[PDB]
Design a protein around this motif. Structure first.
Motif, PDB file in Angstrom:
ATOM      1  N   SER A 214       0.819  -1.213   0.000  1.00 21.93           N
ATOM      2  CA  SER A 214       0.000   0.000   0.000  1.00 21.93           C
ATOM      3  C   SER A 214       0.854   1.264   0.000  1.00 21.93           C
ATOM      4  O   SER A 214       0.481   2.279  -0.600  1.00 21.93           O
ATOM      5  CB  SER A 214      -0.938  -0.002   1.206  1.00 21.93           C
ATOM      6  OG  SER A 214      -1.862  -1.071   1.137  1.00 21.93           O
ATOM      7  N   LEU A 215       2.000   1.220   0.676  1.00 24.28           N
ATOM      8  CA  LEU A 215       2.864   2.388   0.774  1.00 24.28           C
ATOM      9  C   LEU A 215       3.637   2.636  -0.514  1.00 24.28           C
ATOM     10  O   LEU A 215       3.810   3.793  -0.916  1.00 24.28           O
ATOM     11  CB  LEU A 215       3.814   2.196   1.951  1.00 24.28           C
ATOM     12  CG  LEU A 215       3.033   2.037   3.256  1.00 24.28           C
ATOM     13  CD1 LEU A 215       3.929   1.510   4.353  1.00 24.28           C
ATOM     14  CD2 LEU A 215       2.395   3.360   3.668  1.00 24.28           C
ATOM     15  N   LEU A 216       4.096   1.570  -1.175  1.00 21.28           N
ATOM     16  CA  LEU A 216       4.821   1.707  -2.434  1.00 21.28           C
ATOM     17  C   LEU A 216       3.887   2.040  -3.591  1.00 21.28           C
ATOM     18  O   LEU A 216       4.289   2.744  -4.524  1.00 21.28           O
ATOM     19  CB  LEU A 216       5.595   0.419  -2.727  1.00 21.28           C
ATOM     20  CG  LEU A 216       6.539   0.382  -3.932  1.00 21.28           C
ATOM     21  N   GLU A 217       2.647   1.546  -3.545  1.00 21.46           N
ATOM     22  CA  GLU A 217       1.649   1.921  -4.542  1.00 21.46           C
ATOM     23  C   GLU A 217       1.252   3.385  -4.406  1.00 21.46           C
ATOM     24  O   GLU A 217       0.936   4.037  -5.407  1.00 21.46           O
ATOM     25  CB  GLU A 217       0.426   1.011  -4.405  1.00 21.46           C
ATOM     26  CG  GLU A 217      -0.667   1.197  -5.441  1.00 21.46           C
ATOM     27  CD  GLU A 217      -1.796   0.202  -5.261  1.00 21.46           C
ATOM     28  OE1 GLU A 217      -1.705  -0.637  -4.338  1.00 21.46           O
ATOM     29  OE2 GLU A 217      -2.774   0.260  -6.032  1.00 21.46           O
ATOM     30  N   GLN A 218       1.292   3.922  -3.185  1.00 20.41           N
ATOM     31  CA  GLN A 218       0.974   5.330  -2.978  1.00 20.41           C
ATOM     32  C   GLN A 218       2.071   6.231  -3.534  1.00 20.41           C
ATOM     33  O   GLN A 218       1.782   7.304  -4.080  1.00 20.41           O
ATOM     34  CB  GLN A 218       0.759   5.601  -1.487  1.00 20.41           C
ATOM     35  CG  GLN A 218       0.341   7.025  -1.162  1.00 20.41           C
ATOM     36  CD  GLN A 218      -0.999   7.389  -1.775  1.00 20.41           C
ATOM     37  OE1 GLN A 218      -1.061   8.057  -2.809  1.00 20.41           O
ATOM     38  NE2 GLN A 218      -2.081   6.963  -1.131  1.00 20.41           N
ATOM     39  N   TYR A 219       3.331   5.806  -3.416  1.00 25.24           N
ATOM     40  CA  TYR A 219       4.444   6.640  -3.862  1.00 25.24           C
ATOM     41  C   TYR A 219       4.507   6.725  -5.384  1.00 25.24           C
ATOM     42  O   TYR A 219       4.746   7.806  -5.936  1.00 25.24           O
ATOM     43  CB  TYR A 219       5.760   6.104  -3.297  1.00 25.24           C
ATOM     44  CG  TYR A 219       6.991   6.783  -3.854  1.00 25.24           C
ATOM     45  N   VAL A 220       4.286   5.598  -6.072  1.00 23.43           N
ATOM     46  CA  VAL A 220       4.357   5.566  -7.532  1.00 23.43           C
ATOM     47  C   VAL A 220       3.216   6.360  -8.158  1.00 23.43           C
ATOM     48  O   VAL A 220       3.359   6.897  -9.264  1.00 23.43           O
ATOM     49  CB  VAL A 220       4.369   4.113  -8.036  1.00 23.43           C
ATOM     50  CG1 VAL A 220       5.627   3.397  -7.570  1.00 23.43           C
ATOM     51  N   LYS A 221       2.071   6.446  -7.477  1.00 24.77           N
ATOM     52  CA  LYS A 221       0.989   7.300  -7.950  1.00 24.77           C
ATOM     53  C   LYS A 221       1.273   8.777  -7.705  1.00 24.77           C
ATOM     54  O   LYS A 221       0.814   9.626  -8.478  1.00 24.77           O
ATOM     55  CB  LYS A 221      -0.332   6.904  -7.289  1.00 24.77           C
ATOM     56  CG  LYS A 221      -0.857   5.540  -7.716  1.00 24.77           C
ATOM     57  N   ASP A 222       1.999   9.106  -6.635  1.00 22.49           N
ATOM     58  CA  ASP A 222       2.353  10.499  -6.379  1.00 22.49           C
ATOM     59  C   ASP A 222       3.403  10.984  -7.372  1.00 22.49           C
ATOM     60  O   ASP A 222       3.146  11.877  -8.188  1.00 22.49           O
ATOM     61  CB  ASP A 222       2.849  10.655  -4.940  1.00 22.49           C
ATOM     62  CG  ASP A 222       3.107  12.099  -4.566  1.00 22.49           C
ATOM     63  N   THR A 223       4.592  10.391  -7.324  1.00 23.83           N
ATOM     64  CA  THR A 223       5.666  10.678  -8.270  1.00 23.83           C
ATOM     65  C   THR A 223       6.238   9.341  -8.705  1.00 23.83           C
ATOM     66  O   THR A 223       6.747   8.586  -7.870  1.00 23.83           O
ATOM     67  CB  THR A 223       6.756  11.563  -7.646  1.00 23.83           C
ATOM     68  OG1 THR A 223       7.191  10.995  -6.403  1.00 23.83           O
ATOM     69  CG2 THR A 223       6.272  12.998  -7.429  1.00 23.83           C
ATOM     70  N   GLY A 224       6.167   9.054 -10.002  1.00 24.02           N
ATOM     71  CA  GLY A 224       6.423   7.713 -10.500  1.00 24.02           C
ATOM     72  C   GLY A 224       7.882   7.312 -10.498  1.00 24.02           C
ATOM     73  O   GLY A 224       8.490   7.137 -11.559  1.00 24.02           O
ATOM     74  N   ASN A 225       8.448   7.150  -9.304  1.00 26.68           N
ATOM     75  CA  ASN A 225       9.856   6.811  -9.163  1.00 26.68           C
ATOM     76  C   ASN A 225      10.067   6.069  -7.852  1.00 26.68           C
ATOM     77  O   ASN A 225       9.246   6.136  -6.933  1.00 26.68           O
ATOM     78  CB  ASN A 225      10.749   8.055  -9.218  1.00 26.68           C
ATOM     79  CG  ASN A 225      10.815   8.784  -7.891  1.00 26.68           C
ATOM     80  N   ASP A 226      11.187   5.360  -7.795  1.00 26.10           N
ATOM     81  CA  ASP A 226      11.586   4.608  -6.608  1.00 26.10           C
ATOM     82  C   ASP A 226      11.942   5.589  -5.492  1.00 26.10           C
ATOM     83  O   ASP A 226      12.694   6.537  -5.735  1.00 26.10           O
ATOM     84  CB  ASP A 226      12.784   3.733  -7.000  1.00 26.10           C
ATOM     85  CG  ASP A 226      13.051   2.585  -6.040  1.00 26.10           C
ATOM     86  OD1 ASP A 226      12.385   2.447  -5.003  1.00 26.10           O
ATOM     87  OD2 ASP A 226      13.945   1.780  -6.360  1.00 26.10           O
ATOM     88  N   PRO A 227      11.386   5.438  -4.281  1.00 24.58           N
ATOM     89  CA  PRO A 227      11.686   6.420  -3.218  1.00 24.58           C
ATOM     90  C   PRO A 227      13.130   6.436  -2.729  1.00 24.58           C
ATOM     91  O   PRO A 227      13.610   7.493  -2.302  1.00 24.58           O
ATOM     92  CB  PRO A 227      10.709   6.026  -2.100  1.00 24.58           C
ATOM     93  CG  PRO A 227      10.304   4.620  -2.404  1.00 24.58           C
ATOM     94  CD  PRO A 227      10.279   4.549  -3.894  1.00 24.58           C
ATOM     95  N   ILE A 228      13.836   5.307  -2.765  1.00 26.60           N
ATOM     96  CA  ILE A 228      15.190   5.266  -2.214  1.00 26.60           C
ATOM     97  C   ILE A 228      16.197   5.854  -3.196  1.00 26.60           C
ATOM     98  O   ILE A 228      16.906   6.817  -2.884  1.00 26.60           O
ATOM     99  CB  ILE A 228      15.568   3.825  -1.821  1.00 26.60           C
ATOM    100  CG1 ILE A 228      16.979   3.787  -1.230  1.00 26.60           C
TER     101      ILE A 228
END
Lengths: 36, 87, 128, 156, 129
Positions: C26-40
């Motif tokens: 759920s957390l990684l799906e939220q990040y890719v919808k916000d800005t489509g890139n790997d958070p690390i």
């Protein structure tokens, strides 16, 4: 495996007691349908 | 906790990025040096593809597990109503 | 065994193929919808690029899940982040005290490098 | 920039003397919705929002709203007995398997402690060899200088 | 709230039990009488295969989205804590590297002041005589 509309409640401590009331009502809306 | 190839407790776990499954490093390396593949799904996988930050964590105990707990409370109570409605 | 966004212990962990770091779904799906890139690593990553049991013994005294457990979760969320904002404000003040005393020490060495070598040079000129 | 640490064997008075020189130079130079607003206010006030303890408060021979309260107590006791019946069926076994999960997680942290400890020793070990070599170059430079100072007076 | 053949709002929403896609009763029946197939995946499909009613029975047409709203607001709390701890540890590296180097550069002055002092007394005792 086979419309989604998000609820936007209102303009956070009140939302705690709202959840407390709805579980309180659902427990009574379940109980009254059993004794019937 | 277990290795999917052998069944033992892995002392050096590495997770593959083609089929997510916790493999022991010395076991899966021999599997990759045999043929360049992942033993579960038979997809291609190399040694550099197999891989062993700052936010500190705590153990999964009874916020997120509390929200998934109240799902179980209500989805079971929803079946209790069907036993009533069908009767 | 943990999630690399929240600090959870994930129930449906998913791993990314551009940088192998295990995240909760759920957390990684939220990040890719916000800005489509790997958070690390800030590399290109999408939802289809991701690649997909834990037991918690509920307490014997499990009313408390509505009252006492749920208040303590939103107390501990509220107090920690506020103490963490207090932690982030103090270090940026201590960053300023670090660099000012560092630049103060640079002017000491810049002043004393001219003092020492000319004092040694005057000892070499003293012989003549 | 070059300050020898392992080599220089620097008193605490020199730390106080150098800090005064630094202090003298120091004197010369001289994303959320409304949930964030509630959480920041509650933590700043240090006050928690009150939960409903009315279900503990209920009493017999009371009005129609409290009749709803006592029937709420009956639904909570039937749920509490059902929740206690699952735990009894599971046995400790369920508390046992989660404890085995915690020992595996705890062991992974201890291995990360050895990996960082091994690497920080290696960075120190490389630095220690450089300091000893920088010692002999400085000591030979000082010996050659003390020869030249003595010789120049002797020639003159 | 859309059919998958024309795109109209379905007034009798029917579905094929081979490829899950809600159609309308009129259009899917005209497709099946044309060729006995499903329009999306071209698999085998008949008229009796179609499920053709509004489903509401023993169901009685709130609670649930409040937990979903509680999940959605925690989702923002977790993402904010990550970016807040990330900036904490990144400047703590800047704090640590500065303070270690400050005391390392502080030891440069203690060495340099003592050598400067030795050159003072050396020259004054020499220039006197």
């Amino acid at each position: 495996e086979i419309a989604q509309q998000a609820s936007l409640t209102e303009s956070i401590p009140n939302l705690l007691t709202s959840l407390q009331n709805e579980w309180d009502a659902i427990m009574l809306e379940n109980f009254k349908l059993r004794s019937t | 906790m277990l290795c999917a190839i052998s069944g033992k407790v892995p002392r050096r776990p590495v997770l593959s990025p083609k089929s997510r499954t916790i493999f022991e490093k010395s076991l899966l390396e021999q599997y990759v040096k045999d043929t360049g593949n992942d033993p579960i799904t038979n997809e291609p996988l190399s040694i550099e593809e197999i891989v062993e930050s700052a936010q500190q964590a705590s153990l999964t105990e009874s916020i997120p597990n509390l929200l998934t707990s109240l799902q179980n409370e209500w989805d079971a109570i929803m079946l209790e109503n069907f036993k009533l409605r069908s009767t | 065994m943990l999630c690399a966004i929240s600090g959870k212990v994930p129930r449906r962990p998913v791993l990314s193929p551009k940088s192998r770091t295990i995240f909760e779904k759920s957390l990684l799906e939220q990040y890719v919808k916000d800005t489509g890139n790997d958070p690390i690593t800030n590399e290109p990553l999408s939802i289809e690029e991701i690649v997909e049991s834990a037991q918690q013994a509920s307490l014997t005294e499990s009313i408390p899940n509505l009252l006492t457990s749920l208040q303590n979760e939103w107390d501990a969320i509220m107090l920690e982040n506020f103490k963490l904002r207090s932690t982030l404000d103090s270090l940026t003040k201590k960053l300023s005290t670090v660099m000012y005393e560092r630049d103060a020490a640079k002017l000491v060495a810049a002043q004393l490098l001219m003092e020492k070598n000319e004092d040694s040079k005057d000892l070499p000129k003293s012989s003549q | 920039m070059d300050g020898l640490s392992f080599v220089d064997k620097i008193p605490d008075g020199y730390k106080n003397e150098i800090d005064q020189l630094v202090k003298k130079e120091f004197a010369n130079i001289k994303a959320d919705n409304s949930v964030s607003t509630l959480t920041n206010a509650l933590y700043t006030e240090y006050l928690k929002q009150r939960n409903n303890k009315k279900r503990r408060t209920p009493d017999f021979n009371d009005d129609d709203d409290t009749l709803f309260l006592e029937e709420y107590r009956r639904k909570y006791p039937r749920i509490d007995t059902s929740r206690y019946i699952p735990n009894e069926s599971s046995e400790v076994s369920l508390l046992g398997i989660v404890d085995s999960y915690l020992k595996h997680q705890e062991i992974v942290l201890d291995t990360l402690l050895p990996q960082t400890v091994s690497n920080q020793w290696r960075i120190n070990n490389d630095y220690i060899r450089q300091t000893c070599t920088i010692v002999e170059e400085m000591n030979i430079q000082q010996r050659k200088q003390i020869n030249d100072l003595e010789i120049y007076r002797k020639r003159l």
